[PDB]
Symmetry: C5
Subunit: 307 residues, 5 copies
Amino acid sequence: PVDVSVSIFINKIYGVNTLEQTYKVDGYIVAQWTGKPRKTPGDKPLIVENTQIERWINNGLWVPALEFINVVGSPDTGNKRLMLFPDGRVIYNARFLGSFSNDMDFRLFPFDRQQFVLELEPFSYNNQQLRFSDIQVYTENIDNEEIDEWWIRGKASTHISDIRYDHLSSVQPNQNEFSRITVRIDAVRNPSYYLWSFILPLGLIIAASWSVFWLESFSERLQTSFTLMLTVVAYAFYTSNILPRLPYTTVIDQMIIAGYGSIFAAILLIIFAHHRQANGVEDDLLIQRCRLAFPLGFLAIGCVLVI
Amino acid sequence: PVDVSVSIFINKIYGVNTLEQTYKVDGYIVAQWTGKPRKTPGDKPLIVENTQIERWINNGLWVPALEFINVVGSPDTGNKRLMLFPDGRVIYNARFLGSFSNDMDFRLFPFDRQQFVLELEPFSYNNQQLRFSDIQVYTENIDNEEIDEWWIRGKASTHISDIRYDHLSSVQPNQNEFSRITVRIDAVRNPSYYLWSFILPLGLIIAASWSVFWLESFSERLQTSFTLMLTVVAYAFYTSNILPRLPYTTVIDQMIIAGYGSIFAAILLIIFAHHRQANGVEDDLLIQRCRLAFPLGFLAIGCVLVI
Amino acid sequence: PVDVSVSIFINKIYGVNTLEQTYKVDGYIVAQWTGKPRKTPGDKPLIVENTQIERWINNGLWVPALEFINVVGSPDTGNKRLMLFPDGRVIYNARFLGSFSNDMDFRLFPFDRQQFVLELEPFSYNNQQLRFSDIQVYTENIDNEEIDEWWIRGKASTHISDIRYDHLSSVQPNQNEFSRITVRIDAVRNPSYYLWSFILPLGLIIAASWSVFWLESFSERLQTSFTLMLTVVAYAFYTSNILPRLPYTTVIDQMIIAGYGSIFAAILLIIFAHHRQANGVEDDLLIQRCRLAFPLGFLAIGCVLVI
Amino acid sequence: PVDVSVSIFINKIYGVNTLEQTYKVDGYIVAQWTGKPRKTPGDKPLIVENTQIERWINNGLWVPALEFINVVGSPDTGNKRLMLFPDGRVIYNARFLGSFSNDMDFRLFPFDRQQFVLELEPFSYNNQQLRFSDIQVYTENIDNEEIDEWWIRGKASTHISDIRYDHLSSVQPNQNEFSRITVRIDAVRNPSYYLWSFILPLGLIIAASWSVFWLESFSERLQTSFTLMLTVVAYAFYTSNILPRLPYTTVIDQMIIAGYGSIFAAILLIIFAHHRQANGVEDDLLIQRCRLAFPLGFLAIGCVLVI
Amino acid sequence: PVDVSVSIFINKIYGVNTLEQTYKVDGYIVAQWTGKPRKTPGDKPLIVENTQIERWINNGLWVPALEFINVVGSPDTGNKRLMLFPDGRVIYNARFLGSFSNDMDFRLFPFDRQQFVLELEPFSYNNQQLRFSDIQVYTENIDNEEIDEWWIRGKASTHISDIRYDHLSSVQPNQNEFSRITVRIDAVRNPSYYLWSFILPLGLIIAASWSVFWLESFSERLQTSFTLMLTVVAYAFYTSNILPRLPYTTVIDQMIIAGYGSIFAAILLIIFAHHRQANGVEDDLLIQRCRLAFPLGFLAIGCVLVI
Ligand code: NA
Ligand code: NA
Ligand code: NA
Ligand code: NA
Ligand code: NA
Ligand code: NA
């Protein structure tokens, strides 16, 4: 076979779509193999720019097609390079930009912990005709973490493994496995903005909903509860426009549902408290002293849902 | 004719547009037929990469154009392969990405049951010059269902049928039918997020609207009803921004309309209850005891609209 | 001249932009003319696939360029076909997708009645060098009307006419008219969702605004009117986000403006009713009995604005 | 030099981005110059379709590149024509679509008065090698003004002028000026929808804010003022979603800010009126009679801000 | 090596994405070097238009590839020029449009101070084979600052420096540094619209929240506080839709959080004031006199958070 050493450069990672489970990675790719010696002009290596590689391909020069497994569509390939040493080795350099898919679980959304995965595999040649010797990833673009959405933790890991296809055994007897390169890039979401702007006003609004039990008029308590329900609906629509469109509930959504249930339970308990009277002589005071038990129950519910 | 065996690979399915009735499917397509024997270099099969297929086409090699019937525009074709065995058989491999249309009914929106349909047909050659022998679809990319919007149920089905065009009989006497391949992929929408975040707060808000009959002041009942109407408008706009823009009402929209009607009926009944007095001496109490009949009537209306 | 018979296929129509007055039409186009006889290989007709038409064009084969007059930019041309009979006739087949402009009036928005117009004209050749014999449009893709936004009524009409350009008389003495094909496709908007979700809650909210006159406290009437005004603002923003961005008011916008005016008139009349007293002894009762005349006046205003 | 007569056709103008200061213009461009005589086949002029112009360019035919100065990126060039008379003159025809930038001031937004400017200049040849003789613009596509966003007033004006570059004097001694064509197209925004749907409900809401002084309870006046403030916030968010994202305030924004200030001043004056009492015996009546001076002051403020 | 003089023209700068940290720059690039003398037709320099440069490249003419380091994908290259003097010097001119990344800190969002950075470096040739002599940037397009989002302050600065790559030492012994050109363009955000439409109504709403302490009824104070909380939620959602989606809080977000905390503290203090009574005989008056200390405390908090 032919040994190919791959170097992958990463510039900057963006375009995370939560519903589509795609993210955009921009950077360079460097591929280097060894071929037959050629007589280049001069002792210096010969270099071929963009839109001149096709002339050498039509001449008969052998270059492989290293596609990305998890990319959708085609990557936006920029400038391409093809530098030919006279002693035999060929270095291929190109710049790409594409949307890459992954599993990308989003439970515990403000405190996410997910990895960006890049997969590389030759589109044409199998293990017996093309191998990957080693890959050194270059995630050198590391800057201050305070103004970035994603916190890159540690250094990216690389692995080389063989992938066997079951459907290639129909026409190919013993050569049906392909060399694949997988690169994992760990990242942690920045939780400062979400914690400061979403979690804390939920706590303040939920405490405001707890505040309704300190009143003395039943009808005015009902109107206060309906105003609190409208406030919770308004904050729910405020969160849902800014939060992404992932197909399952987060901690914020569970907090919103728990607040809805708390308002409904408050309405039911004050209605039951006003109409516990035998003949209208009893006061709604004995069961109305849940002002120091209802927030403790909600805190217990919160501690249950976190764990 | 020429027999062609087609293999269709599916990577991941996304981009469902409810108004446009389109969805995006990414994957590979493999086409294999048999031709005249050729003298390739060596006993190994000859393989042709991307942007070199056109040279063989200009040379005189016969390849067909297998278009997708239901795609809009043109698919984003990635890397293409053309591998030539010396004993005669030709294998064509390509990767595509495009938006495919379907019927895609969206009634009962949180509990959808719809199929993704891929259609394949040669753009040029009819039944007497090109046939499809068989197709084996490979929907092997199956993962955990908990973090996906669509639940792939079962295995995708394939069918080969002939489609006859009426307009081709003007110039073609007896050869006017085309071999078509149709692939059905069943899917079920994930209902957990919608049921937890939309259906339940509608029930809580509708119960809060039922709660207005437990008051004792007519004017305060009117103000409570207007506050409840504003709350229902707020939740309606909260749902309509997050719910898709399908051109007909769902179960959630019917629930919202029923809540609007319930508030209007509550307003009309309390107005009629206050002004049923002959000379202002009667109390609004006899007809106001619909507090345990109005929710039962709404539940009956709901049971009617579900069935 | 050369006679050309055009067949236009329509797949599905979507992408209606109300502000841009554009819509997207996908389908096929078939052009057929007659040329000099040629010696094709065998008695069977010779067929040319995609990206091989240019070789025959460079050889000297005459094909025209049939552009769309009302399209913006360039259509997304898919696979193209070029089939050469040996007795002389040439059949050209292609698939397109583009955004087509029209007048597209949107007054009476929920009950629209507008036509989709496709225009075809040769980009290069005039009447003396190219003619259109006839066109048969194929709008065969007709399905159930219940789940579609647009109701296709009847069958599409076709017309062939000559268009004369005034600016071509500077260099061309007597040949300045071009053969043009115009295809009209009638369509009616689906009014069920709009009528169920927008018109009816406007009626309910306007009746709720009528309900304010049944109170007995002037200050509480003012607060009720301000709450109703906030509700109408909320529903106005609910409609304006979902309704399109056409540059003029619809029936829904006129209803919203009339509701605003009704609330303002209610506020002015109750203010005048409270302060019609000579020395504070009169009751606001005689002029406050417009509870059964104000809705009739609003219904008269509605009947005026519909007609 | 070589004289070139340019004809510019305009189809329809759309895509106005207020923040980006770009607009989309679709139409044709016709360029005509005179060259050496050639022997075309027959006495009829020879015509070259799309994707065959490059063959004549490679042969040695001289065509210039007429770029647009104010376009961003590249225009979406459709079909191109190249018609060669045998007596010498060459006519070049092409269709374009691109986004053109301008100054495009947006102060007095509902009553805008701005011009669309198209600039043309050869990309390669200066005044001594290429000149523009004259341009006749064809804005013939004029229709009814009632259903269009922009009112085209008058006929478009054209001007031919020379533009001198300072940086070209380093290598070019006396030939550093370029012939430029500038076309001005005047347009007026349609004010009917904005005046009916935004300005009038602002007046109604501001009158509703004026209505708070007619009450008799200080606390109820405060609650009414807070409800009016919430209504003004709701209408502000209703306007800001539909109004464009221009980086400075319009008349509507100034009206909204003035309404905010009016509510704040009303709150401050009623607070001062309640607490002007020496020992709680005075009534808030003498300074509370600004009910017929505060709207006059707001009208004076409005008349100041308009002028 | 070969000396290359670069001239960069800037047309207009737009498309600032706060989350993606990208901005769009349109303009020209001019590259000039010196090569071997050639015999052009005539004493005039020979000029090569678009889509004819590739013929000279295939002939053997040496042109470099000057890529942008910080661009994502590929720039939208418009018309390209290649003008060949007969005495030896080559001038290359091209027009580009692309999205360029930067650090682009957004703290103190209404009063931003950030620089637009353009980086240029040859994609292929190192310092020993290609050098940049000097660059003169032309930011001549300066207009009135009143109608622009970004205020260009001063003149753009240019710098030429060498960038050494560590990974190129594996195959290249002593030639591993690349000549890079960096251009800084300073800009200041326009603060007039933000200050007039966001900061001032926050102050008015916060003063309205301060106004709640002037009441005399505890329950009515609670309802006023809940209405103020709903108003603050409404204004928060009004700001968050118009403000960008940067991943950290701005001054406006800190003001909103401080207003939430002020409302919660007001609720807690009035609840504590009503229930400081030993047996219900005390009045909530002594601690309720924080009406002239709570705004001073909030102003102190604001002065702390600004500094
Ligand atoms: Na009240
Ligand atoms: Na709202
Ligand atoms: Na929105
Ligand atoms: Na909204
Ligand atoms: Na309220
Ligand atoms: Na509200």
